[PDB]
Amino acid sequence: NLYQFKNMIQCTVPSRSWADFADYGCYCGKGGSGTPVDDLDRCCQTHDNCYNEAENISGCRPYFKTYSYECTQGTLTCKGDNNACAASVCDCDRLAAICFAGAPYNDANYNIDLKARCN
Ligand SMILES: CN1[C@@H]2CC[C@H]1C[C@H](OC(=O)[C@H](CO)c1ccccc1)C2
Ligand SMILES: [Ca+2]
């Protein structure tokens, strides 16, 4: 669920608050369209596409589905006690959190004008 995703990010990128990723580029956050603006935005596009896939699973609501995961000692793990939906969503979030940590953050790309720049 989104609370868990926030915590994955807080755990893989403790140097930056999480709100830093909540409205970035064309894909991080509410946004979902256009040319990704940089590598971090690409991490968000993959994440967004991963959620759209998970939504194909019956009753599967990625923002809301509570899954089972752990973050400690630098490692994030989706646990084996996850159903198909939980496992899929947990995987999307884990991959995105890892991606976020490896991607440069560009202050210029925070809170861009989606309507004009993401067609
Ligand atoms: C309800 N939340 C979603 C749609 C609008 C808001 C904020 C969104 O934020 C994100 O999509 C990013 C990137 O996945 C994110 C960053 C930090 C916490 C939660 C989500 C998801
Ligand atoms: Ca999005």
From Swiss-Prot:
Its EC number is 3.1.1.4. GO terms for molecular function: calcium ion binding; calcium-dependent phospholipase A2 activity; phospholipid binding; signaling receptor binding. The active site is at residues 47, 93. GO terms for biological process: arachidonate secretion; fatty acid biosynthetic process; lipid catabolic process; phospholipid metabolic process; positive regulation of fibroblast proliferation. It is an enzyme of class 3 (hydrolase). GO terms for cellular component: extracellular region. The lineage of its organism: Eukaryota, Metazoa, Chordata, Craniata, Vertebrata. Binds 1 Ca(2+) ion. Its cofactor is Ca(2+). It holds the Pfam family Phospholip_A2_1. Ca(2+) binds at residues 27, 29, 31, 48. PLA2 catalyzes the calcium-dependent hydrolysis of the 2-acyl groups in 3-sn-phosphoglycerides. It catalyses: a 1,2-diacyl-sn-glycero-3-phosphocholine + H2O = a 1-acyl-sn-glycero-3-phosphocholine + a fatty acid + H(+). Belongs to the phospholipase A2 family. Group I subfamily. D49 sub-subfamily. This is Acidic phospholipase A2 3. It is found in: Secreted. Keywords: Calcium, Disulfide bond, Hydrolase, Lipid degradation, Lipid metabolism, Metal-binding, Secreted. Disulfide bonds join 11-71, 26-118, 28-44, 43-99, 50-92, 60-85, 78-90.
